[PDB]
Structure 1
Amino acid sequence: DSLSKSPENWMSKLDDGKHLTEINIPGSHDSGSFTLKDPVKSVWAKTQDKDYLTQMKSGVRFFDIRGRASADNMISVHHGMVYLHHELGKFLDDAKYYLSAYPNETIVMSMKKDYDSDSKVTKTFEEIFREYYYNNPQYQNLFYTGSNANPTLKETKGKIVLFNRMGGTYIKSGYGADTSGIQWADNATFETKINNGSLNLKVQDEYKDYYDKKVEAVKNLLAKAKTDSNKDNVYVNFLSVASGGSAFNSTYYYASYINPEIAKTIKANGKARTGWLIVDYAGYTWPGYDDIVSEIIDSNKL
């Protein structure tokens, strides 16, 4: 059986000497938005319909968590201004539960501030995450705390590895975990060195593209990863794209074309390096069309 037939424990089937950068990982864009039920606001603000545990059982291993500091000890999960009905502990609790059940998987968790803090807040978003989550005794043992800037599956499995979008941080473990953080370009394909030049991050995050330009941008970075065997290069390729507003195409509309187009491309490439591909409506299938999460999983060599 191919790896995608067992998406709950697909990492457990790989050689754990691989660096995570070398694994082809499916991620979900604005992971926590599955809570939204308002159909007007959902056109533009909603990007998933499966909850965190269901995304995990479906093979998603990179979670894009964007937040707003709602109290000096709390980060709320957001899509910009839009509150997603939960705080960050809910994601961490679900991740902890999953990684205990499937201990040979690793989760990569991106953390970004997506909106200004509540007026009562006195601490920076980075301070709050560092002191009330990362260093919270409650999450002892949950996070990758090692000092390798390019960690392997063996040393990260069972744990969450921080992918730091917060800017400079005093946290010392995970991608971008130094006082420079990651220099991220708005609406662009870009490359930037992270972890004190230890890694070359290559991102396609042109989130305001229209359809044909977005497919072009995804396939261009997909083609670069295919010929790049350098373990010190890390590829993050967002398939997700913004709606132009409620009267325009929904994010689901675009996902419904992009996901199968890119899934078709990957499958026709066979077992080639893709990088980490971040998608809307992860696990959403359309009869007759290739499933992007399954095809990213099956692209991994055994």
Structure 2
Amino acid sequence: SDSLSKSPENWMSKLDDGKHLTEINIPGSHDSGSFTLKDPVKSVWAKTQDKDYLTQMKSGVRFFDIRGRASADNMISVHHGMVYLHHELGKFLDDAKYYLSAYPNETIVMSMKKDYDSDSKVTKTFEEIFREYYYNNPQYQNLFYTGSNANPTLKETKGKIVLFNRMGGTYIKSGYGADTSGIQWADNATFETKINNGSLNLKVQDEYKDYYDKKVEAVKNLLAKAKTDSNKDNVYVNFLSVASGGSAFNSTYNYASYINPEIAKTIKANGKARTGWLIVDYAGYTWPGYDDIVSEIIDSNKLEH
């Protein structure tokens, strides 16, 4: 009997798959695709991960914050705002497909958001392109969750990607926010909004411009709410990440190196409490002598069965 965080490649397999994904404490990666950046000056503000998708997944990351730009009427490139990340969306999809084959009792939650203006030559909306060339593309048949449950369990989603829709209104009908209203997302804020035709209450802390100390308080205030809430119809998404700023090199990495351990320590002190889904920069990046945020999120899940 070892800690779940001792097997991060297949920790969701150790859970009771009757759980709703909402009741699982899931580590996510912010701006997941940005691991390919090498330029040092650009990486200060634009790079948020050093591991690739398969290595994030092996370290136990199950929520991926994929940001896209429409490069052609049939193509979505992964971006951080203006910055091209050097791979297209099919790349993440192939990695997830492969990972889910090898670890069939895990599920992956994929947040999809438009992060920059489409190429000139594009004539289609980003949502249409995603819908027709990825979600409904026969090439990724069976890969996505296509159920009609607004609050799906681990059993119904494992081995599949569940869409977390940050595209706005969509004609896709499966996954979080998959309706023609989409998710009302407040800018730089802690907020709450109903999604899936009012079936779920989404509670978000996404104050991405906060400085160190304010950010930690914002993450801790939403952690304290999740701890008292056992309602499976509430979903918590808590971003520990922040935009860079302070000196020429107060990078996203520097913020993560302070935020991650502090929040990791707090979750460890809390024991088995519900945390929600915590989305972090530099997932899996450890520092000698400090607690590891991804491991602490994983271990905060209480087993009983």
Indicate whether the TM-score tops 0.5: yes
Deviations, residues 121-162 of structure 1 (Å, cap 9, x unaligned): 000000000000000001000000000000000000000000
Deviations 1:183-233 (A, max 9, x none): 000000000000000000000000000000000000000000000000000
The separation in 2 between residues aligned to 1:232 and 1:165, in whole angstroms, is: 19
The normalised TM-score by structure 2 is 0.98
- Cα separation, 1, equivalents of 2:57 and 2:156: 20
SS of 1:240's equivalent in the other structure is coil
Deviations for 1:257-278, whole angstroms, at most 9, x for unmatched residues?
0000000000000001000000
1:246 aligned counterpart, secondary structure: coil
Structure 1 residues 245 and 89 mapped into 2: Cα distance closer, same or farther (>3 Å)? farther
Tell me by how many angstroms 1:247 deviates: 1.2
Q: Counterpart of 2:263 in 1: which secondary structure?
A: helix
| Contact 1:41–1:246 (Cα < 8 Å) also in 2 | no
> 2:84 & 2:210 partners in 1: Cα distance?
24
| Structure 1 CA distance for aligned equivalents of residues 213 and 35 of structure 2 | 26
Aligned to 1:144: 145
Does the aligned pair in 2 maintain the 1:40–1:246 contact within 8 Å? no
Q: Deviations for 1:46-89, whole angstroms, at most 9, x for unmatched residues?
A: 00000000000000000000110000001100100001000000
Cα distance in 1 between the residues matched to 2:168 and 2:13: 32
SS at match of 1:97: helix
Q: Distance in 2 between matches of 1:122 and 1:245?
A: 40
Instruction: Name the SS for the 1:94 alignment partner.
Output: helix
Q: Confirm or deny: 8 A CA contact 1:66 1:79 kept in the other structure.
A: yes
SS in 1 for 2:256: helix
Give secondary structure in 2 for the equivalent of 1:249. coil
Gaps of 5+ in 1: none
Alignment-derived partner of residue 299 in structure 2: 298
Secondary structure of 1:224's aligned partner:
helix
SS in 1 for 2:254: helix
Q: Matched residues in 2 for 1:219 and 1:127: separation?
A: 38
Shift of 1:244: 2.5
Q: Tell me the secondary structure at the aligned position of residue 252 of structure 1.
A: helix
Kindly indicate whether the alpha-carbon contact (under 8 Å) linking 1:44 and 1:246 is maintained by their aligned counterparts in 2. Answer: no
Residue 246 of structure 1: CA displacement? 7.6
The runs of 4+ residues in structure 1 deviating greater than 6 Å are: none
Contact 1:44 1:245 in 2 (8 A): no
Corresponding residue for residue 56 of structure 1: 57
| 1:43–1:246 CA contact under 8 A, matched in 2 | no
1:203 equivalent in structure 2: 204
* 3-state SS in 2 of match to 1:50: coil
Aligned alpha-carbon RMSD (Å): 0.7
Distance 1:74 1:205 in 2: 28
- Taking the aligned partners of 2:100 and 2:246, their CA distance within structure 1 comes to 37
**CA-CA distance at 1:14 after TM superposition:** 0.2
Q: Distance in 1 between matches of 2:264 and 2:214?
A: 17
1:88-119 superposed Cα distances (whole Å, 9 cap, x missing partner): 00000000000000000000000000000000
Distance 1:16 1:211 in 2: 37
Report the more deviating stretch, 188-197 or 241-250: 241-250
d(CA) in 2 for partners of 1:244 and 1:70?
30
**Corresponding residue of 1:47:** 48
The answer for the alignment partner of 1:221 in structure 2 is 222
Unaligned runs of 5+ in 2: none
Normalised by the length of structure 1, the TM-score is 0.99
1:91 corresponds in structure 2 to 92
2: CA distance between counterparts of 1:238 and 1:207?
8
Partners of 1:22 and 1:275 within 8 A in 2: yes
**Alignment identity in percent?**
100
SS at match of 1:147: coil
Measured in 1, the distance between the counterparts of 2:227 and 2:247 equals 37
* 1:96 partner SS: helix
Residue 245 of structure 1 deviates from its aligned partner by 8.0
CA contact (8 A) 1:205 1:237 kept: yes
1:74 & 1:149 partners in 2: Cα distance? Answer: 28
Q: How many residues align?
A: 302
SS of the counterpart of 1:68?
A: strand
